[PDB]
């Protein structure tokens, strides 16, 4: 449960090597942020190229092919070509893998 | 709902008009980064379930 996540995060802040000692001018920084428009700015071809490394290629073609479909509202039809369809079943995988690609950009490969 | 649909239909046609907003070099960078990470962890790809996976 997410409150356990908060409790373990507080315990991890506490249990570092000399984390509250500021006798020599050390600093602690706590960044919190949100990836703006993470759901709308996923290109589907790049998603397919990054998705063919982990599954069979027909599976990746099926996962990319579902995102390119026409959305309708009662009079209005438009096709989708940029950004993922977030209400799919398997889309819970797509956000969690693509955001993993963000961790290689932020955190670095060595860390 | 109709206003957001008119905005979405406009921005999708703007993406189709202006081309891809990503460059090739950044795509090669993130692709080779993912290749180096998955080869660093020895990840075996997920196979297609052939005839009977028994799950």
């Amino acid at each position: 449960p997410p409150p356990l996540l908060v409790y373990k995060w507080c315990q991890g802040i506490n249990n570092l090597q000399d984390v509250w000692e500021t006798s020599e001018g050390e600093c602690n920084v706590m960044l919190e942020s949100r990836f703006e428009k993470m759901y709308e700015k996923i290109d589907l071809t790049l998603l397919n190229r990054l998705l063919r490394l982990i599954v069979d290629h027909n599976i990746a073609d099926y996962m990319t092919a579902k995102n390119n479909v026409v959305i309708n509202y009662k009079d209005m039809n438009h096709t989708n070509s940029y950004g993922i369809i977030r209400g799919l079943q398997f889309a819970s995988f797509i956000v969690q893998y693509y955001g993993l690609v963000m961790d290689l950009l932020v955190l670095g490969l060595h860390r | 709902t109709r206003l957001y649909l008119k905005a979405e239909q406009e921005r999708q046609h703007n993406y189709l008009k202006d081309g891809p907003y990503i460059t090739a070099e950044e795509a090669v960078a993130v692709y080779t980064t993912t290749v180096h990470w998955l080869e660093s962890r020895r990840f075996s790809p997920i196979p297609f379930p052939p005839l009977s996976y028994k799950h």
Partner: peptide, 22 residues
């Protein structure tokens, strides 16, 4: 296999896609 090449694309958009995604 046999890469996707989205239903959709116009001429120059296909050219740019084949340029930057290959």
């Amino acid at each position: 296999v046999q890469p996707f090449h989205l239903r959709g694309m116009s001429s120059t958009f296909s050219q740019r896609s084949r340029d930057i995604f290959d």
